[PDB]
Design an enzyme around this catalytic site. Structure first.
Site, mmCIF file in Angstrom:
data_model
loop_
_atom_site.group_PDB
_atom_site.id
_atom_site.type_symbol
_atom_site.label_atom_id
_atom_site.label_comp_id
_atom_site.label_asym_id
_atom_site.label_seq_id
_atom_site.Cartn_x
_atom_site.Cartn_y
_atom_site.Cartn_z
ATOM 1 N N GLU A 35 3.860 9.945 -54.646
ATOM 2 C CA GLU A 35 3.347 9.196 -53.505
ATOM 3 C C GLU A 35 3.558 7.695 -53.670
ATOM 4 O O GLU A 35 4.000 7.022 -52.741
ATOM 5 C CB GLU A 35 1.863 9.501 -53.299
ATOM 6 C CG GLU A 35 1.562 10.902 -52.791
ATOM 7 C CD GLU A 35 2.066 11.180 -51.405
ATOM 8 O OE1 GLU A 35 2.545 10.238 -50.736
ATOM 9 O OE2 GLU A 35 1.981 12.357 -50.986
ATOM 10 N N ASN A 46 4.352 4.780 -41.337
ATOM 11 C CA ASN A 46 4.869 5.976 -40.706
ATOM 12 C C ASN A 46 5.437 5.631 -39.335
ATOM 13 O O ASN A 46 5.037 4.647 -38.701
ATOM 14 C CB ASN A 46 3.758 7.016 -40.596
ATOM 15 C CG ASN A 46 3.160 7.349 -41.945
ATOM 16 O OD1 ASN A 46 3.891 7.609 -42.904
ATOM 17 N ND2 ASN A 46 1.828 7.321 -42.042
ATOM 18 N N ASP A 48 4.947 6.871 -36.536
ATOM 19 C CA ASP A 48 3.970 6.867 -35.459
ATOM 20 C C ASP A 48 3.044 5.662 -35.489
ATOM 21 O O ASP A 48 2.197 5.536 -34.605
ATOM 22 C CB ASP A 48 3.184 8.175 -35.402
ATOM 23 C CG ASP A 48 2.262 8.385 -36.597
ATOM 24 O OD1 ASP A 48 2.027 7.461 -37.414
ATOM 25 O OD2 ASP A 48 1.741 9.522 -36.692
ATOM 26 N N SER A 50 0.833 4.746 -37.948
ATOM 27 C CA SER A 50 -0.115 4.784 -39.047
ATOM 28 C C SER A 50 0.556 4.249 -40.313
ATOM 29 O O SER A 50 1.779 4.116 -40.382
ATOM 30 C CB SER A 50 -0.654 6.194 -39.240
ATOM 31 O OG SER A 50 0.350 7.082 -39.649
ATOM 32 N N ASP A 52 0.222 4.508 -44.794
ATOM 33 C CA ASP A 52 -0.309 5.130 -45.995
ATOM 34 C C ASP A 52 -0.557 4.066 -47.054
ATOM 35 O O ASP A 52 0.303 3.206 -47.289
ATOM 36 C CB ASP A 52 0.692 6.150 -46.555
ATOM 37 C CG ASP A 52 0.946 7.334 -45.644
ATOM 38 O OD1 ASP A 52 0.222 7.558 -44.664
ATOM 39 O OD2 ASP A 52 1.891 8.096 -45.989
ATOM 40 N N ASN A 59 -3.746 7.985 -45.527
ATOM 41 C CA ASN A 59 -3.223 7.649 -44.199
ATOM 42 C C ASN A 59 -4.311 7.129 -43.265
ATOM 43 O O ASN A 59 -5.357 7.758 -43.104
ATOM 44 C CB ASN A 59 -2.598 8.933 -43.625
ATOM 45 C CG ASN A 59 -1.752 8.719 -42.386
ATOM 46 O OD1 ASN A 59 -1.893 7.730 -41.707
ATOM 47 N ND2 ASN A 59 -0.882 9.679 -42.080
ATOM 48 N N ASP A 101 -11.107 19.244 -47.272
ATOM 49 C CA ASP A 101 -11.174 19.445 -45.826
ATOM 50 C C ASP A 101 -10.557 20.753 -45.343
ATOM 51 O O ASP A 101 -10.539 20.990 -44.129
ATOM 52 C CB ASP A 101 -10.580 18.243 -45.073
ATOM 53 C CG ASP A 101 -9.060 18.241 -45.026
ATOM 54 O OD1 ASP A 101 -8.398 19.195 -45.497
ATOM 55 O OD2 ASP A 101 -8.511 17.243 -44.491
HETATM 56 C C1 LIG Z 1 -8.082 16.702 -38.992
HETATM 57 N N1 LIG Z 1 -7.838 16.576 -40.418
HETATM 58 C C2 LIG Z 1 -8.246 17.801 -41.087
HETATM 59 C C3 LIG Z 1 -6.425 16.336 -40.651
HETATM 60 C C4 LIG Z 1 -8.606 15.460 -40.937
HETATM 61 C C5 LIG Z 1 -9.942 15.385 -40.199
HETATM 62 O O1 LIG Z 1 -10.813 16.362 -40.699
HETATM 63 NA NA NA Z 2 3.094 10.184 -48.128
#
Ligand SMILES: C[N+](C)(C)CCO
Ligand code: NA
Ligand SMILES: C[N+](C)(C)CCO
Ligand SMILES: [Cl-]
Ligand SMILES: [Cl-]
Ligand SMILES: [Cl-]
Ligand SMILES: [Cl-]
Ligand SMILES: [Cl-]
Ligand SMILES: [Cl-]
Ligand SMILES: [Cl-]
Ligand SMILES: [Cl-]
Ligand SMILES: [Cl-]
Ligand SMILES: [Cl-]
Ligand SMILES: [Cl-]
Ligand SMILES: [Cl-]
Ligand SMILES: [Cl-]
Ligand code: NA
Ligand code: NA
Ligand code: NA
Length: 129
Positions: A35, A46, A48, A50, A52, A59, A101
């Site tokens: 990374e 990026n 778009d 955003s 990193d 990000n 997540d």
């Molecule tokens: C939507 N994501 C899982 C990519 C991040 C927010 O929880």
């Molecule tokens: Na990356």
């Protein structure tokens, strides 16, 4: 700050990443290598719009605020600049949220493409931890 692999492994262990969410230290060091090349100041924009940030290339689309990513979230509740510090605490704490997540370390595309399934222990081999 540009870390060496064992220096970074030791810092990641101190800050609680060793086997965090079941990911061994070699996985985290491998991810950081590809990374950021172990450079805490790395930034990459990026297509778009955003950006990193830092050692783990977190990000602004979801995780930190930089004021210039329309429609984004700030789920680590931190300025993106905090992820560029020589002390890795903020990046580690935010990475813990990311990896928790649902998709594990697949959130880091470079981990999926370059570390996943490989002999990641080689990244911490010989290190005094
Ligand atoms: C939507 N994501 C899982 C990519 C991040 C927010 O929880
Ligand atoms: Na990356
Ligand atoms: C580059 N190292 C040899 C340090 C680890 C890669 O597997
Ligand atoms: Cl640096
Ligand atoms: Cl080192
Ligand atoms: Cl693992
Ligand atoms: Cl490992
Ligand atoms: Cl980071
Ligand atoms: Cl923004
Ligand atoms: Cl938010
Ligand atoms: Cl902010
Ligand atoms: Cl540190
Ligand atoms: Cl997982
Ligand atoms: Cl993400
Ligand atoms: Cl070893
Ligand atoms: Cl060492
Ligand atoms: Na190395
Ligand atoms: Na954001
Ligand atoms: Na703004």
């Amino acid at each position: 700050k540009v870390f060496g692999r064992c220096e970074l492994a030791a810092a990641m262990k101190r800050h609680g990443l060793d086997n965090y969410r079941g990911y061994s230290l070699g996985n985290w060091v491998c991810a950081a290598k590809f990374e950021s090349n172990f450079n805490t100041q790395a930034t990459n924009r990026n297509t778009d719009g955003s950006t990193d940030y830092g050692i783990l290339q977190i990000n602004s689309r979801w995780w930190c605020n930089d004021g210039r990513t329309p429609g984004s979230r700030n789920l680590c509740n931190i300025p993106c600049s905090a992820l560029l510090s020589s002390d890795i605490t903020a990046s580690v704490n935010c990475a813990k949220k990311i990896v928790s997540d649902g998709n594990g370390m697949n959130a880091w595309v470079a981990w999926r493409n370059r570390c996943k399934g490989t002999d990641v222990q080689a990244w911490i081999r010989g290190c005094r931890l």
